[PDB]
Amino acid sequence: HHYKVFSPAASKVCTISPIMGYSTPWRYLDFNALNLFFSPLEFQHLIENYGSIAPDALTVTISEIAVKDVTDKTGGGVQVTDSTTGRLCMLVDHEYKYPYVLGQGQDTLAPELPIWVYFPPQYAYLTVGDVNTQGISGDSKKLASEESAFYVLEHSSFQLLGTGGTATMSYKFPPVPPENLEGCSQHFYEM
């Protein structure tokens, strides 16, 4: 369960400065796509029957948790058993303590079909730092600086969930402008 510094070198277009960040042993849940919530039929029904849409409220429930032990199978391979002492750590960051990486167009979403298993992404984030010249080479890396935020999620309180455990997050969206689902039959410059 290592924390690692994400630190590529820079030397073809680079970013404005070399990026630096941290990779954590935590996973996180990404469900930030509309097509997860609507089947194709339901989305047709939405756009056929309603003039606008806005997000209102969200609930995330984790249920049927199984922490599964693995051991060697007779005759080779491995076999799996349910663990009564294994725990799934769940940390819900209501405070936004931790760098927010959702909503970046990344390939991290829940599967589009309900028949597919979600493999939640590893949590990793970029932070500010100081650009240090790599000796004579003139190539550059961003080294950590006093401003560089190193977050250790194990330093906070989080829930330990056993097998069969359930936990629920709830969120209310702020008021936001609805997306208009209906178009225009006129050019505004031809009124």
Partner: protein, 226 residues
């Protein structure tokens, strides 16, 4: 190399600003031709391949089309924000992200909608972090053990419930029918239906008979006057 709208300290040291502001399209059917923006983002590709894009026909109608020149009597593509401007945002589509965090910088202009789609939020849905609690392997009278962890993995069911507020449809005064709310078209055969690809002359066998549309499915088919 990095094409399209970008900002930085030199040609070699830049970030992409794609897709650019929501107040401009990056793909639409122009009158006889699909036009795609240099700033376009693709929600996957039809197989690298042909991009999958929203048809921003409501922006094209309101002088926001790609390659719209503005003439200052002198010819340029840039329009400044003018007092008394009106425009359409890029359409929400079936595959759009729902939100992004508005960065909590000091000030901002019209950040209610994120460039990749959905709503800009200062306090978005909170991140849920999960990991398995590491379990120590045995230490004691057994020889040569070292330190180990128990091989454990976790599974479960993530259930996500989202409520959306829905506005009513606008009343229609037209005599003639509204346009059909067509379902979107696939590159081969039909989208969202499991089909046997050996029955059809479509060339999307790599999709194994379940196909996404090649357009992003955008609503806005029905229209009302201004």
């Amino acid at each position: 190399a990095l094409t399209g709208l970008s900002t930085g300290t030199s040609q070699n040291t830049r970030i992409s600003l794609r897709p650019g502001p929501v107040s401009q399209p990056y793909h639409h059917w122009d009158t006889d031709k699909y036009v795609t923006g240099i700033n376009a983002i693709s929600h996957g590709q039809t197989t690298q391949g042909v991009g999958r894009f929203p048809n921003e026909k409501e922006q094209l109608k309101q002088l926001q089309g790609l390659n719209m020149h503005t003439y200052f009597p002198t010819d340029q593509i840039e329009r400044p924000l003018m007092v008394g401007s009106v425009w359409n945002r890029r359409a929400l589509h079936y595959e759009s992200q729902l939100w992004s965090k508005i960065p909590n910088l000091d000030d901002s202009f019209k950040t209610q909608f994120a460039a990749l789609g959905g709503w800009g939020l200062h306090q978005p849905p909170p991140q849920i972090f999960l990991k398995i609690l590491p379990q120590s392997g045995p230490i004691g009278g057994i020889k040569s053990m070292g330190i180990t962890t128990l091989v454990q993995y976790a599974v479960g069911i993530m259930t996500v419930t989202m409520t959306f507020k829905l506005g009513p449809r606008k009343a229609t005064g037209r005599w003639n029918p509204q346009p059909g709310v067509y379902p979107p078209h696939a590159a081969g055969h039909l989208p969202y239906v499991l089909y046997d690809p050996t029955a059809t002359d479509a060339k999307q066998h790599h999709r194994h008979g379940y196909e996404k549309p090649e357009e992003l499915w955008t609503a806005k088919s029905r229209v009302h006057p201004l």
